Amino acid sequence: GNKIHFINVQEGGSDAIILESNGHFAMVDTGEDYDFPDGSDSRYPWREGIETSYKHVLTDRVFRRLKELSVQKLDFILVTHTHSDHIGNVDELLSTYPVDRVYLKKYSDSRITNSERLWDNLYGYDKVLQTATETGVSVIQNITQGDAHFQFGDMDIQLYNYENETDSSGELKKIWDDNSNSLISVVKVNGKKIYLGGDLDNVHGAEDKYGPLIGKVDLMKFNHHHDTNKSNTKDFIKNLSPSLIVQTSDSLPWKNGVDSEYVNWLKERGIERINAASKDYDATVFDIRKDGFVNISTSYKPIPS
Numbered sequence: 001g002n003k004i005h006f007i008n009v010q011e012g013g014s015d016a017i018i019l020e021s022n023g024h025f026a027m028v029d030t031g032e033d034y035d036f037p038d039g040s041d042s043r044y045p046w047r048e049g050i051e052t053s054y055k056h057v058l059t060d061r062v063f064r065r066l067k068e069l070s071v072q073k074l075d076f077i078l079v080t081h082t083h084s085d086h087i088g089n090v091d092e093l094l095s096t097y098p099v100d101r102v103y104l105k106k107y108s109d110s111r112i113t114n115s116e117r118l119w120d121n122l123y124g125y126d127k128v129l130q131t132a133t134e135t136g137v138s139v140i141q142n143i144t145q146g147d148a149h150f151q152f153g154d155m156d157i158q159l160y161n162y163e164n165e166t167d168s169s170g171e172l173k174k175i176w177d178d179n180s181n182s183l184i185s186v187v188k189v190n191g192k193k194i195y196l197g198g199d200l201d202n203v204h205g206a207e208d209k210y211g212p213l214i215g216k217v218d219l220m221k222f223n224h225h226h227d228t229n230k231s232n233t234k235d236f237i238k239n240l241s242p243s244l245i246v247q248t249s250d251s252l253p254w255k256n257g258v259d260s261e262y263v264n265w266l267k268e269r270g271i272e273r274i275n276a277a278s279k280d281y282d283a284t285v286f287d288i289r290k291d292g293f294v295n296i297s298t299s300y301k302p303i304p305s
Ligand SMILES: C[N+](C)(C)CCOP(=O)(O)O
Pocket: 013, 049, 050, 051, 083, 084, 085, 119, 120, 179, 199, 224, 225
């Protein structure tokens, strides 16, 4: 305690984050996995853009880091949303580690208004529910007020955008993409604050709404890897006013190519920005101290090699 490990991608964008406090371990998201549905089960039909590439898989880096840390137990796994590059390794983790619970908001294909954004989502969701039932791992889907503040080693954690919002009948409210449903975590320890918002976007107003409620932080994980079209809205960055942005991506901020204007804007504001992308190390690690964040990535063994 107290450290945050952002598992590095080889290529593309994917989130797996390990929180380490005192001697406790937890995960915020789990990264993309080898498995995917092929359409042999019509519940999970093939659809175009389901991820298949081993170059985008984080499975081996996640499991190697956990083993290198002598993890015996995860106190929780928090899942931000159902996309495979976030929920992907949950059932593999549930099958390997003791886990005391999982935070997983409700999902249904029916609540996504675009058929071309269903992909893999349900397969991943249903892997969590089925595997957690087989292992007796408690799944918190109806997160009370609640529930949404709580204590993890030395870390104080506050959740946002955690409710299952319903229509009448209710039925989950319709959204354009599961990104807008992203479960947000703010972690506070040693006088520092870290925002972790999955693939939060502003398509249904979530950045406009939660920016002012979250307020000032020190370290911000970029929303949705690198996108500046529908995420990482300037009002949202100014609300959080982070000293450091970490991207779980090998790409610079991106809107029809490198958003050089946006990259320049961050430098002008004095915001440092780093990519958690590597061929040499499993994670970009910060030590979270009273004095600031120290990048201790090179203090771990490299990937063999
Ligand atoms: C689910 N997916 C991996 C096929 C699409 C990409 O997800 P996103 O990171 O752009 O929301």
